Amino acid sequence: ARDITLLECVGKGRYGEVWRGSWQGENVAVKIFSSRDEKSWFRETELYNTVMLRHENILGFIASDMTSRHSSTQLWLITHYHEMGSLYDYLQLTTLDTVSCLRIVLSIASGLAHLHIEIFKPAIAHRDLKSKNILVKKNGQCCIADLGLAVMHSQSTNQLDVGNNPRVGTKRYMAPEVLDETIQVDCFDSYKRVDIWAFGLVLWEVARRMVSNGIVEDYKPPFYDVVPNDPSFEDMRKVVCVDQQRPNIPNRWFSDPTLTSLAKLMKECWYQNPSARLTALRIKKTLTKID
Amino acid sequence: RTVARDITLLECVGKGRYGEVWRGSWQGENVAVKIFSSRDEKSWFRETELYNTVMLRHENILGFIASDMTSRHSTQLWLITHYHEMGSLYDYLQLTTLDTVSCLRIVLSIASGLAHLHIEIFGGKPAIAHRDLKSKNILVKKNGQCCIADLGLAVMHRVGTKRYMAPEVLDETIQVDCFDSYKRVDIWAFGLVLWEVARRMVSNGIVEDYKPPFYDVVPNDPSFEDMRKVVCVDQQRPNIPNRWFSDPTLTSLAKLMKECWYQNPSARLTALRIKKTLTKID
Numbered sequence: 001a002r003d004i005t006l007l008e009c010v011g012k013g014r015y016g017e018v019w020r021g022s023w024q025g026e027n028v029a030v031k032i033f034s035s036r037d038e039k040s041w042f043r044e045t046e047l048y049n050t051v052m053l054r055h056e057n058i059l060g061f062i063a064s065d066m067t068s069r070h071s072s073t074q075l076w077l078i079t080h081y082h083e084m085g086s087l088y089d090y091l092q093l094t095t096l097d098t099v100s101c102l103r104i105v106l107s108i109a110s111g112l113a114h115l116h117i118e119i120f121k122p123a124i125a126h127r128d129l130k131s132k133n134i135l136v137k138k139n140g141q142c143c144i145a146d147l148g149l150a151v152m153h154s155q156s157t158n159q160l161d162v163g164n165n166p167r168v169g170t171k172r173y174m175a176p177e178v179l180d181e182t183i184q185v186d187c188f189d190s191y192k193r194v195d196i197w198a199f200g201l202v203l204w205e206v207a208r209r210m211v212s213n214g215i216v217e218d219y220k221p222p223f224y225d226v227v228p229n230d231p232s233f234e235d236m237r238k239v240v241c242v243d244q245q246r247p248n249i250p251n252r253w254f255s256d257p258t259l260t261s262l263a264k265l266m267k268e269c270w271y272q273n274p275s276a277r278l279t280a281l282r283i284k285k286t287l288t289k290i291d
Numbered sequence: 292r293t294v295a296r297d298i299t300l301l302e303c304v305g306k307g308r309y310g311e312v313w314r315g316s317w318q319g320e321n322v323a324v325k326i327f328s329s330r331d332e333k334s335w336f337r338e339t340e341l342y343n344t345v346m347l348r349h350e351n352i353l354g355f356i357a358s359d360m361t362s363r364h365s366t367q368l369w370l371i372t373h374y375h376e377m378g379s380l381y382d383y384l385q386l387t388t389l390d391t392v393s394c395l396r397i398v399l400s401i402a403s404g405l406a407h408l409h410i411e412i413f414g415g416k417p418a419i420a421h422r423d424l425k426s427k428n429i430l431v432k433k434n435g436q437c438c439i440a441d442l443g444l445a446v447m448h449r450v451g452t453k454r455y456m457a458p459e460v461l462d463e464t465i466q467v468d469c470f471d472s473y474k475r476v477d478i479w480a481f482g483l484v485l486w487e488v489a490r491r492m493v494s495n496g497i498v499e500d501y502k503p504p505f506y507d508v509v510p511n512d513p514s515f516e517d518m519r520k521v522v523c524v525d526q527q528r529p530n531i532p533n534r535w536f537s538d539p540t541l542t543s544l545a546k547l548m549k550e551c552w553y554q555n556p557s558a559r560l561t562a563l564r565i566k567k568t569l570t571k572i573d
C-alpha cells in the first residue's frame with residue numbers, strides 16, 4: 001500500500017504547502033514544494049538517505065517523490081505528522097512549567113547534537129533552525145524539521161558537501177557572520193556555530209513562556225522590539241551587526257534558578273566571535289544537569 | 292484528493308549490478324521501474340538531480356515519470372519511466388535484420404536524441420553528456436524510432452562501459468575541464484552503436500551476425516588494459532565488411548562511423564552534423 005489521501009492544508013508559504021494526509025489509516029505530513037524551492041526538496045532527499053539520521057528528535061522520513069508528466073513537476077516529501085504543530089504555534093497558546101520548558105529545550109539540544117556529531121553518519125549543520133522548524137510531540141519532546149539547507153561533513157574521509165541551494169536561512173535567526181556575509185563558507189564548524197546562534201534564539205523564545213513566581217512573558221519572536229515587521233536582511237544586519245543587539249533577559253528570570261541557568265546558556269550561544277559559542281554537545285550536557 | 296502511488300511490479304525484465312528493471316502498472320498503464328542496488332544509488336541521485344534541473348521531454352529520450360525514495364526496516368530508490376515492450380536495441384539486433392529505411396530510422400532517432408542531450412538552450416536546458424551510450428542503453432519503440440536511456444552517469448554544463456570508451460578515456464588524456472570533451476566521448480560511442488546497427492542491415496542478400504564492438508580483438512568483459520591496447524596503442528577500429536561498399540547507404544554509414552572514431556576528439560563530427568548527414572542519405 002502506497003495510496004495517500006490529502007485531508008487538509010496545515011501550512012502554505014513561498015516554500016509550498018504542507019497537508020495532513022492518511023496512509024494505511026495513519027496521519028502523514030505531505031510537503032509539496034514550490035518549483036522555486038526544488039533545490040531544498042533535493043537536498044532534503046539526500047539528507048534523509050542517511051540511515052543513522054533517524055532519531056526521536058529529528059522529523060521522521062517516510063518517502064520523497066519527484067513526479068512529472070509533460071512540462072509539470074511535483075516534488076513531495078512525506079513525513080510523520082505532529083498534530084500539536086510547530087513550537088512557534090505551541091508557545092502562543094500555552095505557558096510552560098519548569099519540567100516542560102527543560103524537556104522541550106533538552107530535546108531540541110539532543111536533536112541538534114545528533115545532527116552536529118559525526119558517527120563512525122556524517123556531521124550535519126541545519127542552517128535554518130527556528131521555532132517554525134521544530135515540531136511538538138505528545139510526549140513533550142520536540143523534533144527538528146527541514147533539512148533543505150543542511151551541510152554535511154565527514155572528518156573520516158575529509159568530505160564537505162555544502163550543496164548548491166541559493167536559499168538562505170530565515171533572516172530573523174541569522175548569525176552576525178551570516179548577516180555581514182563574512183562567514184567562512186568552506187569551514188564546516190562555521191555552519192555548526194550559526195546553528196548554535198539560532199538555538200540560543202529558540203531557547204529565549206521558549207524560556208519567556210516558562211512561568212516563575214506567577215510571572216510569564218508573552219510569546220514574541222527574536223528581535224520583535226528592534227526591527228520592522230517582516231524584517232529585511234539589512235534590518236537584521238543593522239540590529240545584530242551594527243547595534244550589537246541581543247534578546248533582552250527579563251529581570252524576573254534572575255529570581256528562578258532554571259531561568260538564570262538558561263539565560264547564561266543562551267548568552268553563550270550569542271558571542272559575535274563564532275568560536276566562543278558553546279557546542280551542541282556542551283549545551284545538551286548543561287541542560288541534562290539543570291532542573 | 293487521493294494520490295494513487297500504488298505501482299504493481301508485474302515481471303522482472305532486467306537484473307544486474309545496477310539492480311533490477313520491472314514491467315509495472317500504474318492505473319492499467321505500463322511503466323518501467325528501475326530498483327537500484329545500494330552499489331548504484333549514485334546513479335539514482337544523478338538522474339533525479341538532472342530531472343529536478345531540466346524536465347527533458349523528447350521522443351528519442353526515455354520518458355521520465357517519477358523518482359521515488361521510500362524508507363524500509365534501509366532506503367529503496369526507484370526510477371519510473373515509460374515502458375518499451377520491444378526492449379533494448381542490443382536485444383532487438385540479436386533476432387532481427389534491418390532494411391535501409393528501418394536502419395536509417397534507428398540511427399537518425401539515436402542522433403536526434405543525442406543532439407537534444409548535447410545542445411544548450413537558453414531561456415531551455417543545459418548541455419548534457421550521457422557518458423554511457425551503448426546499444427543496451429537504447430530502447431526500441433513500436434514506431435521504429437529508438438530512445439536513449441539511463442542518465443545515471445550524465446553530466447550537465449561508476450565510469451562508462453569499457454568496451455565503448457573513447458581513446459582519450461582509456462589513455463587518461465580527456466581534457467576534463469572542457470565540456471565538449473564529454474560530447475566527443477559520446478560521439479565515439481555513437482560511432483560504435485552505428486557499426487552494431489549497420490551490420491544488421493541487409494544488402495544484396497547479405498547481413499552480418501549481431502556482434503558487440505571489438506568482439507574479435509578483446510574478451511567478454513574486457514579489462515581497461517585490454518581496451519587501451521586495442522584502441523590507443525594499436526589504434527584498431529571496427530571492421531567495415533567489403534559487402535557494405537556495394538550498398539550506397541552502408542557506404543555513407545561507413546564514412547559516418549569513421550568520422551566518429553578519429554583519435555583526435557576535436558576532429559569528430561557533432562551530433563548535429565551527424566543528423567544533417569543522415570537526412571541526406573537515401
Ligand SMILES: COc1cc(-c2cncc(-c3ccc(C4CCN(C)CC4)cc3)c2C)cc(OC)c1OC
Nearest residue numbers: 066067068069070072073317318320322355356357
Ligand atoms: C507523474 O505521472 C503522471 C501523472 C498524472 C497526473 C495525475 N493527476 C494529476 C495530474 C496533473 C493535473 C494538472 C496539472 C497542472 C495543470 C495545469 N495547471 C496550470 C497546473 C496544474 C498537473 C498534473 C497528472 C499529470 C497522470 C499520468 O498519466 C495518466 C502520469 O503518468 C503515469
Ligand SMILES: COc1cc(-c2cncc(-c3ccc(C4CCN(C)CC4)cc3)c2C)cc(OC)c1OC
Nearest residue numbers: 010029030031077079081082085086089133145146
Ligand atoms: C517545518 O517543516 C515541516 C513540517 C511538517 C509538519 C509535520 N507535522 C505537523 C505539521 C503541522 C501540523 C499542524 C499545524 C497547525 C498549527 C498552527 N495552526 C495555526 C495551523 C497549523 C502546524 C504544523 C507540520 C507543518 C512537515 C514537513 O514535511 C512533510 C516539513 O518539512 C520538512
Ligand SMILES: COc1cc(-c2cncc(-c3ccc(C4CCN(C)CC4)cc3)c2C)cc(OC)c1OC
Nearest residue numbers: 065067074076293294295296297317356357359371
Ligand atoms: C507522491 O508520489 C507519486 C504520486 C503520483 C501522483 C498520483 N496521482 C496524482 C498526482 C498528481 C499530480 C499533479 C497534481 C497537481 C494538481 C494541480 N495542482 C495545481 C498542482 C499539482 C496533483 C496530483 C501524482 C503526482 C504518482 C506516482 O507514481 C506514478 C507517485 O510516485 C509513487
Ligand SMILES: COc1cc(-c2cncc(-c3ccc(C4CCN(C)CC4)cc3)c2C)cc(OC)c1OC
Nearest residue numbers: 304312323324325370372374375378379428440441
Ligand atoms: C537501459 O535503462 C533502462 C531501461 C528501462 C526499460 C524500459 N522499457 C523497457 C525495458 C525492457 C522491457 C522488456 C525487455 C525484454 C524482456 C522479455 N522479452 C524477451 C523481450 C523484452 C527488455 C527491456 C527496459 C529495460 C527502464 C529503465 O529505468 C526505469 C532504465 O534505466 C534508465
